[PDB]
Amino acid sequence: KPAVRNVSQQKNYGLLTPGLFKKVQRMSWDQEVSTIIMFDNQADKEKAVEILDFLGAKIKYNYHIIPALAVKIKVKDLLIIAGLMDTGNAQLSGVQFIQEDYVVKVAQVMATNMWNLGYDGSGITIGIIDTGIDASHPDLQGKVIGWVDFVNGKTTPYDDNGHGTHVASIAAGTGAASNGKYKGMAPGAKLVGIKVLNGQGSGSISDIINGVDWAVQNKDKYGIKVINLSLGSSQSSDGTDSLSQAVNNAWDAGLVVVVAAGNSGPNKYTVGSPAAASKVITVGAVDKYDVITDFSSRGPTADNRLKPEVVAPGNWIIAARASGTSMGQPINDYYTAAPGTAMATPHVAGIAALLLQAHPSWTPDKVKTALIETADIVKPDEIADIAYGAGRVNAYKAAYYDNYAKLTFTGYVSNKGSQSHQFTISGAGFVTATLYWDNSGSDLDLYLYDPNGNQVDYSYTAYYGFEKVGYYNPTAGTWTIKVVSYSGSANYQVDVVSDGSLGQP
């Protein structure tokens, strides 16, 4: 196993992130800097408005989804609230941290959707947080029921880049212009266009958070159940920055949040924000043969958590070409092909919309679980780990989750102990077993044994989140799962899922 990192758990310069502290060290007093101030709660955030007005700092946003302000502030003034420059002497009260509001930037071709399903995401609305949507594209017409433009303030949908349209169509395109061939994963779903990225595909953290905020504020009005963020930076993140917090909070408000892993692989620790947010679904990219792409970002997070959780097709994906744009590699007037974890992301968002159509009562955690547990183990010796996560999502299995046999095991393992559980299986094309546990400081591993008692799969990442094993055409008989503490104790749960019959001996 890879030796791990630190840890370590106290790194900020008072209120300033290290990155922001360095930034302002090279600046002079009268210059301006764009920041996000995260407070410990909403009332503390509110108290600070009057003080920031006094100093003449300019509040760009006052957020609901996080207790934070997006603030443009002179260095001298920022030194004052940071407690680094005495009039106080005191740090601004109730501040958790102040970060930089920095800028985010975004052939064998293939269709996104290789399935025919009974569901199509009817009655579900997906928010596309991106460059916009070309709602005049034949595959999207009448779909865009909601719209906001935080870049230019235009009040009618458009897309001046191409990226957001391509993404929107992978998620929910009807495929009308190819008679279905390049439909998205959720052809019956509605869309809301949330433009936070400019024509160059660039945007500020503050704008992206505001787009997440808007989606949450407006979730009831437009029936938003899923949001899509095909955007991020890839500076290794621990998922505690303002944008990560915002997407985690949006998850808790009841939205399925689906985020691109990033395109900065194959190196490990290339998962940044908001890819690192623990709660959301972070999505890597495979090519058309189910092989992880070289560019797909690898985890773990900066704090050693397992990311991405799943991967999806993200290499030269054909989808809607926004009127007047030419992103990637044009196929014809209506369609263009592009690679990226940005293409993988909406594939998963649309599947999420199927599942929510199929199961109106499912929470986001339930959607995430079904995706993880049903994902195809396309590369057994690398699953679960920080390139493939749990494997490549399978829209058919995810959507038909409930038709499958299930078995749940639980127990406790002490430091370096194990537990085993036998189960019987027959008539199966597949079985998977997925392991969770409570103690995030503990590393548990998962092993799967055939009826001869021989190990046919293992899952032993060092990085905490889950473990995942399974087998295709498992021979009928009594199989064993073993839960092993590599280090540390925990209470655990293993879900076994199969299309065969599942029993106990």
- Least separation in angstroms between residue 454's CB and Ca ion is 15
Separation between Cα atoms, residue 142 and residue 190, nearest integer Å: 8
111 or 484: whose CB is closer to Ca ion?
484
Report if residue 380 touches Ca ion, rule: CB under 5 A. Answer: yes
For the segment 444-473, give every residue that binds Ca ion (CB under 5 A). 445, 457, 459, 461
- Least separation in angstroms between residue 470's CB and Ca ion is 8
To the nearest 10°, report the CA torsion of 261, 112, 226, 188: 170
- Least separation in angstroms between residue 434's CB and Ca ion is 12
Strands (E) in 232-375, as ranges, are 256-260, 281-286, 310-313, 317-320, 329-330, 335-338
- Which positions from 265 to 304 touch Ca ion by CB under 5 A, shown as an x/- string? ----------------------------------------
DSSP assignment of 44-78, as one string? HHHHHHHHHHHHT-EEEEE-SSSSEEEEEEEHHHH
297 or 461: whose CB is closer to Ca ion?
461
DSSP assignment of 165-211, as one string? HHHHHHHH---GGGTTTT--S-TT-EEEEEE-S-TTSEEEHHHHHHH
252 in Cβ contact with 243 (< 8 Å)? no
162 or 389: whose CB is closer to Ca ion?
389
Could you tell me which stretch among 80-88, 147-155, 165-173, 378-386 binds Ca ion (CB under 5 A)? 378-386
- Which positions from 408 to 447 touch Ca ion by CB under 5 A, shown as an x/- string? -----------------------------------x-x--
Report if residue 127 touches Ca ion, rule: CB under 5 A. Answer: no
172 in Cβ contact with 147 (< 8 Å)? no
Quote the distance between the C-alpha of residue 272 and its chain's center: 11
- Least separation in angstroms between residue 440's CB and Ca ion is 12
Pairing of strands 281-286, 256-260: parallel
- Least separation in angstroms between residue 34's CB and Ca ion is 40
Number of residues that bind Ca ion (CB under 5 A): 7
- Least separation in angstroms between residue 375's CB and Ca ion is 12
2 or 18: whose CB is closer to Ca ion?
2
- Which of 475, 446, 440 shows the shortest CA–CA distance to 460? 446
263 or 434: whose CB is closer to Ca ion?
434
Separation between Cα atoms, residue 190 and residue 146, nearest integer Å: 9
- Which of 145, 158, 156 shows the shortest CA–CA distance to 199? 158
Separation between Cα atoms, residue 448 and residue 498, nearest integer Å: 14
Report if residue 121 touches Ca ion, rule: CB under 5 A. Answer: no
Place of tokens 């890819």: 275
> Vertex 221, ends 219 and 222: CA angle to 5°?
70
- Is residue 493 classed as helix, strand or coil in its secondary structure? strand
Single-letter amino acid, residue 387: A
- Least separation in angstroms between residue 248's CB and Ca ion is 23
Could you tell me which stretch among 102-110, 253-261, 383-391, 495-503 binds Ca ion (CB under 5 A)? 383-391
- Least separation in angstroms between residue 461's CB and Ca ion is 5
- Which positions from 59 to 98 touch Ca ion by CB under 5 A, shown as an x/- string? ----------------------------------------
314 or 380: whose CB is closer to Ca ion?
380
- Is residue 356 classed as helix, strand or coil in its secondary structure? helix
332 or 420: whose CB is closer to Ca ion?
420
- Least separation in angstroms between residue 311's CB and Ca ion is 14
Contact residues for Ca ion, defined by CB under 5 A: 380, 383, 443, 445, 457, 459, 461
